[PDB]
Each structure stands twice: as C-alpha cells, then as structure tokens.
Design a binder for this molecule. Structure first.
Ligand SMILES: O=[N+]([O-])c1ccccc1O[C@@H]1O[C@H](CO)[C@H](O)[C@H](O)[C@H]1O
Length: 151
C-alpha cells in the first residue's frame, strides 16, 4: 500500500507535510474547508483486489497544537465525524492500482487566525491489508497552510 501528496514520490508510512491553499479570510460562524482529496491519494500496490488494503483515520487525530482550542468536523468516506476525532472512522477499502484521492475533508469552525507554514492539524491514518498479518502501517498527515487566514 502506497500514497503520495500532490503526485509526488511514493509514501509507505510515516509523517508527511500536506500543503493547502485556504480561503484568506474566515467568516465568523462559517466553516473553513480543507479539502484533502485535492492532495492525498493512495493505491493498492498489486491492483486487482488481490491483497485488499483497509484504511481508516484514527482516534486522537486533532488540531495542532498550538490551535487546539478549535472545533470542527472531519469528513471521511461517507461519514462526517466531530473533530478532533474521539473514535476510529469507518474503513475505506483500496484494491485498485489506479490512485484514489482520499475522500477526506476537514471543516474548521471559528487578526491572523492561521499562520502559513505552521502545522494546523495532525491526521493519523491506519492501514492493514488482507493476507498474512496484513502488514499494518501508520501514516500521519501534517496539514500546513500556504497562506495566512484572517478574521
Ligand atoms: O508497500 N509497498 O511498497 C509495496 C510495493 C510493491 C508491492 C507490494 C507492496 O506492499 C504490499 O502491498 C500490498 C497491496 O497494496 C499490501 O498492502 C501489503 O501489505 C504490502 O506489503
């Protein structure tokens, strides 16, 4: 099982920065959207649904931190969860070699509120396959804005 960010080199585990362009202003009482399907994709390294991968997001995934005071929602594969995550999400099954953009969106409920270049969320993703032990692996996606977000 492998992923990449913005079509870059393959990733098999570990922590990766994911840079995102956000709305430069965050309106009071309105959600700021961080569409991660636009950046992260993963695939089965054989294809053909032979050793199918099973992917979920993990309890404890949260805002960073410093910025933990915020609340929000995390959309993952047909379900919208409160964020930070207090439980593991549903499982997404990956069996094609064609990359699948992750069905993942973060919603952030509100001078500069978000600083470009700082980690603003840490999303832990868990993989286990089907054959043998399943060869479980952990990924962490460190979400970083390319731009300031204000008021
Ligand atoms: O993870 N890999 O870098 C990798 C590259 C080529 C072939 C298998 C492979 O890993 C294998 O992939 C299969 C299907 O995705 C399962 O995830 C299995 O657990 C993994 O070891």
């Amino acid at each position: 099982f492998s992923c990449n960010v913005d079509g870059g080199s393959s990733i098999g585990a570990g922590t990766t920065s994911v840079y995102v362009n956000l709305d430069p202003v965050i309106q009071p009482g309105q959600n700021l959207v961080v569409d991660l399907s636009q950046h992260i994709s993963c695939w089965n390294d054989y294809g053909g649904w032979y050793d199918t991968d099973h992917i979920n997001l993990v309890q404890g995934s949260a805002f960073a931190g410093s910025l933990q005071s915020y609340k929000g929602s995390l959309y993952w594969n047909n379900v919208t969860y409160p964020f930070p995550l207090t439980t593991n999400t549903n499982v997404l099954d990956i069996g094609d070699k064609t990359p699948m953009p992750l069905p993942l969106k973060l919603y952030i409920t509100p001078g500069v509120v978000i600083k470009a270049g700082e980690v603003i969320a840490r999303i832990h993703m868990y993989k286990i396959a089907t054959l043998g032990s399943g060869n479980p692996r952990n990924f962490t996606w460190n979400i970083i804005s390319n731009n300031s977000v204000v008021m």
